[PDB]
Enzyme design. Structure first.
Site, PDB file in Angstrom:
ATOM      1  N   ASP A   6      24.828  44.801 -29.700  1.00 20.90           N
ATOM      2  CA  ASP A   6      24.471  43.430 -29.450  1.00 20.90           C
ATOM      3  C   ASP A   6      25.679  42.524 -29.696  1.00 20.90           C
ATOM      4  OD1 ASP A   6      23.088  41.065 -29.199  1.00 20.90           O
ATOM      5  OD2 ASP A   6      22.573  41.073 -31.332  1.00 20.90           O
ATOM      6  N   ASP A   8      25.860  38.297 -30.290  1.00 18.72           N
ATOM      7  CA  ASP A   8      25.585  37.248 -31.267  1.00 18.72           C
ATOM      8  C   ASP A   8      24.864  37.801 -32.482  1.00 18.72           C
ATOM      9  OD1 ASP A   8      26.760  35.429 -29.602  1.00 18.72           O
ATOM     10  OD2 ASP A   8      24.890  34.475 -28.930  1.00 18.72           O
ATOM     11  N   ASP A 202      20.383  42.978 -33.954  1.00 24.34           N
ATOM     12  CA  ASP A 202      20.024  41.998 -34.968  1.00 24.34           C
ATOM     13  C   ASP A 202      18.656  41.300 -34.851  1.00 24.34           C
ATOM     14  OD1 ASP A 202      20.666  40.129 -32.950  1.00 24.34           O
ATOM     15  OD2 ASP A 202      22.003  38.993 -34.265  1.00 24.34           O
TER      16      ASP A 202
HETATM   17 CL   LIG Z   1      23.329  38.121 -28.307  1.00 22.62          CL
HETATM   18 GD   LIG Z   2      20.838  36.404 -34.195  1.00 22.11          GD
HETATM   19 GD   LIG Z   3      20.066  35.220 -30.884  1.00 21.19          GD
HETATM   20 GD   LIG Z   4      21.441  38.830 -31.258  1.00 17.64          GD
END
Ligand SMILES: [Cl-]
Ligand SMILES: [Gd]
Ligand SMILES: [Gd]
Ligand SMILES: [Gd]
Ligand SMILES: [Cl-]
Ligand SMILES: [Gd]
Ligand SMILES: [Gd]
Ligand SMILES: [Gd]
Lengths: 251, 251
Positions: A6, A8, A202
Site C-alpha cells: 500500500d 499512504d 494499513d
Molecule cells: Cl493509499
Molecule cells: Gd491510512
Molecule cells: Gd487512506
Molecule cells: Gd492506506
C-alpha cells in the site's frame, strides 16, 4: 519474492513522503526484490510519485504493466499496457445516481467536485487534486457520518461495491486488491519469483491484499486484522522494520 | 401601488411556468402597476426568465436597477445599476472555509460543485445549473438533514447568516428580502407610487418580505404566518386570485 505494498500510511506517510522507508526500498531493490505499489490512488497520482509499472491503481480496478512486459496482456494505453479489472468510472457514476435516488440523500463524489474543492477537503494542491480526480474505475465519496448506513445499503441495492481507506468511502464494481494482486502474479515472467508474495497495508481496503499474499504485515494504527503481523510503529517505519525483521532473513 | 413578489412557488409554479398568473401580470402592466421580482435566484436566472429590472436577487443580496433609473444609486454594470446590500460571494465562501474547519466537517455548496452535479441535485438542466452557480452574494448549501444543526451553529460562529427556501439552506451576510424592498421603495422615482406596497410569497424566507410591505399575501403550502393574508389555492393560481380580490378592486 515479490513485495506488494500500500502507499499512504504504509510505504509513504499520509503526505507522500517515504520517510524511513526509502532506505528500506533501497535494500529491496539492491537485492533484486520486486516492489509493487497497490493503492487507491489513480494512475496520474502514481506517476507523480515517480513510481513505475508494474503497479495496481484504484483499489485493484486497474493493473499496469510496462509496455514491454514479457507476458503479453491487456491493451496498450499510454506507455504501459493496461488490464482493466473493474467497471469503468462512467458506469460507476451512472449507478451512483440510481443509488442516490434510492437513498433520497445527496451522494457526492470527486466527480461532483471541483479540483479546488477536492484540494480543500484533502489538504492537497490544486494539481495533486486534479490527479486524484482523474479516476478510471473507482469513485471517492464524501459522505457525512450520519448518512453512511443509508448510503451503503443504497450502493448494495444498485449493485455497487464499497470500501474505505480510513477517511473517505469508495464505490466501484470488480475492484479488489487481492484480485489484482492475484492476476499480476499469474502474469509474472518468473513463477519462482512470484511464488512467495509479501503484502503490506494499513486500512480496511487492505484485507483483500493481505488475503492474497503469503506473508501479510499490518503497519496501521489499530490492532492488526486477524492473523496478520504487526510492527512497533505505524507507516514507513513499520515498513522499514518489516523488511529488516521479516523480509531480509527469509531473503 | 407596487407589487413585490416571490417567484418559485408564487408567481411561477415549481415547474417554472406562469399558468393562471399570466393574465394577472397582463392586467397589472395594463394598469401601470410595477411588479418587482424578489427572489433567491441569481441575476442570470432572472434573465433566463425574461424579467426586466428593477428586480431583487439572491434573497435581497442585490438590487438591480435599470441603468437610467431616475434616482441615482448603485454601481453601473452594462444595462443595470447594482445596489449591493450583502457581502460578496467570495467573502461568504471564505467564511465558509473557516466554518468548515470549526465544525471539523465538510461544508459543501454550489461553489464546490460542477454544474453537472448541481443539475442532478436540482433536477435542472446543465445550462440552468450554470445560471444557479453564477452567484454574487448568497451560497446554496448541500447538507444532509442530519448534519444541518452542527453546520448552522458553525455558520453563525463565523458571522454568517442562514436561511432556507424549503429545501437547501443558504448562507450570506446582509441578504434580506425585507431590507432590499425597503431600500427599493426609498429609491422609487415617484414616492406616492411606492407608498402602498404589496408583497406575495410562499416560504420561510418570505417573512422578511411580508414584514416590509403594507399588504402581505401568503400563497404557500399550509397556513399563513400570523398577520398575513392567504388564498384558497397556492402558486400562480393564488397570485391571480390575490390580484383579482385584493388588488384590482382598489384601483
Ligand atoms: Cl493509499
Ligand atoms: Gd491510512
Ligand atoms: Gd487512506
Ligand atoms: Gd492506506
Ligand atoms: Cl424563488
Ligand atoms: Gd419560493
Ligand atoms: Gd416553494
Ligand atoms: Gd423553494
Amino acid at each position: 519474492m515479490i513485495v506488494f505494498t500500500d502507499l499512504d500510511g504504509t510505504l509513504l506517510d499520509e503526505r507522500g513522503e517515504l520517510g524511513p522507508a526509502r532506505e528500506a526500498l533501497e535494500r529491496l531493490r539492491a537485492l533484486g526484490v520486486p516492489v509493487v505499489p497497490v493503492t487507491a490512488k489513480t494512475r496520474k497520482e502514481v506517476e507523480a510519485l515517480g513510481l513505475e509499472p508494474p503497479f495496481i491503481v484504484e483499489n485493484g480496478g486497474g493493473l499496469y504493466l510496462p509496455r514491454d512486459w514479457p507476458v503479453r496482456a491487456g491493451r496498450p494505453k499510454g506507455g504501459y499496457r493496461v488490464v482493466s479489472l473493474a467497471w469503468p468510472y462512467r458506469k460507476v457514476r451512472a449507478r451512483l445516481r440510481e443509488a442516490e435516488a434510492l437513498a433520497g440523500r445527496p451522494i457526492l463524489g470527486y466527480g461532483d467536485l471541483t479540483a479546488e474543492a477536492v484540494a480543500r477537503l484533502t489538504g492537497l494542491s490544486r494539481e495533486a487534486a486534479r490527479r486524484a480526480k482523474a479516476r478510471e474505475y473507482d469513485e471517492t465519496l464524501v459522505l457525512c457520518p450520519e448518512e453512511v448506513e443509508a448510503v451503503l445499503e443504497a450502493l448494495e441495492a444498485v449493485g455497487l461495491e464499497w470500501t474505505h481507506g480510513g477517511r473517505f468511502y469508495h464505490a466501484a464494481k470488480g475492484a479488489d486488491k487481492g484480485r489484482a494482486v492475484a492476476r499480476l502474479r499469474a502474469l509474472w515472467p518468473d513463477p519462482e519469483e512470484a511464488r512467495f508474495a509479501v503484502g503490506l497495508g494499513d486500512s480496511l481496503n487492505d484485507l483483500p491484499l493481505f488475503r492474497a499474499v503469503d506473508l501479510a504485515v499490518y503497519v496501521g494504527r489499530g490492532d492488526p486484522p486477524e492473523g496478520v503481523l504487526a510492527t512497533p510503529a505505524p507507516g514507513p517505519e513499520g515498513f522499514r522494520y518489516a523488511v529488516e525483521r521479516y523480509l531480509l532473513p527469509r531473503l
